[PDB]
Design an enzyme around this catalytic site. Sequence first.
Site, PDB file in Angstrom:
ATOM      1  N   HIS A  46       0.725  -1.218  -0.016  1.00  0.00           N
ATOM      2  CA  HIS A  46      -0.094  -0.019  -0.175  1.00  0.00           C
ATOM      3  C   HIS A  46       0.731   1.151   0.056  1.00  0.00           C
ATOM      4  CE1 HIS A  46       0.177   0.431   4.401  1.00  0.00           C
ATOM      5  NE2 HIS A  46      -0.060   1.782   3.979  1.00  0.00           N
ATOM      6  N   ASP A  97      -0.659  -7.522   1.912  1.00  0.00           N
ATOM      7  CA  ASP A  97      -0.110  -5.979   2.012  1.00  0.00           C
ATOM      8  C   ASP A  97       1.230  -6.295   2.355  1.00  0.00           C
ATOM      9  OD1 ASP A  97       0.094  -3.196   2.079  1.00  0.00           O
ATOM     10  OD2 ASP A  97      -0.717  -2.991   3.710  1.00  0.00           O
ATOM     11  N   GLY A 196       2.434   6.571   8.769  1.00  0.00           N
ATOM     12  CA  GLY A 196       4.052   6.815   8.473  1.00  0.00           C
ATOM     13  C   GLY A 196       4.724   5.414   8.892  1.00  0.00           C
ATOM     14  N   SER A 198       3.625   2.528   8.576  1.00  0.00           N
ATOM     15  CA  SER A 198       3.229   1.526   7.633  1.00  0.00           C
ATOM     16  C   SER A 198       4.611   0.872   6.937  1.00  0.00           C
ATOM     17  CB  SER A 198       2.379   1.980   6.579  1.00  0.00           C
ATOM     18  OG  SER A 198       0.896   1.999   7.039  1.00  0.00           O
TER      19      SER A 198
END
Lengths: 245, 14
Positions: A46, A97, A196, A198
């Site tokens: 993502h 993801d 941030g 992630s």
Amino acid sequence: IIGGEFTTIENQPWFAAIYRRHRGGSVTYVCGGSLISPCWVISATHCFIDYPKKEDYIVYLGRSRLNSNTQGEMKFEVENLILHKDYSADTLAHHNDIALLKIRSKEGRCAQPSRTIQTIALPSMYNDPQFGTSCEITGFGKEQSTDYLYPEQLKMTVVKLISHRECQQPHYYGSEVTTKMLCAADPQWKTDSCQGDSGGPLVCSLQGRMTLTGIVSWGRGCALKDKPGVYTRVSHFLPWIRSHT
Amino acid sequence: GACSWRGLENHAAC
């Protein structure tokens, strides 16, 4: 990271800081990642899906600060950016993801391990810690959900693993959480990953070794009651990782 | 909003 504590890269030497070049030359922070071998950083799809061009990205290892250099750091270009073919997203959940960045310096080198740059072990297949196990999360993510800026200094905190059964409860995330995800949160909901963070590591001690158990993926707000952090469950992606590396 | 959450970093609509 909401709450927790400031840290430096020596405490999380596998942590990768991923930035994107613009579009007139500004560089902005995108996401965290984890060094799993000298040439490979693992992160979240993502973080890159909207701008999948490898040339747009810069990766740093050995970096403790967001906008200033850290002694001993290494800067890399992205040789290859591999997103998961089965990625999908809804309003909330991001499925599959997971992303791999093959890193290479201008001089054509991969990472050189040091006191500030080390790899993190991958877990053995389908092997996760039990629920209630305390794990660490690291990143340059927001310190408060309302913040406009990211912290300049690296942070880390501790969150406890939640069971699939508890996390699939309607008051939590219901069906949004799959068996290829892991939930984790603070018992008081007072500390968490946030925007941030992630792509960054959820690290747990397993069989006596620090292990990359999760990758920060998604969640509703941050450090919010009944809304855990949701992490890509690395132990369910080992064939994908092995093949693509 | 959703653009302030984990999941929407580096998104064109944010």
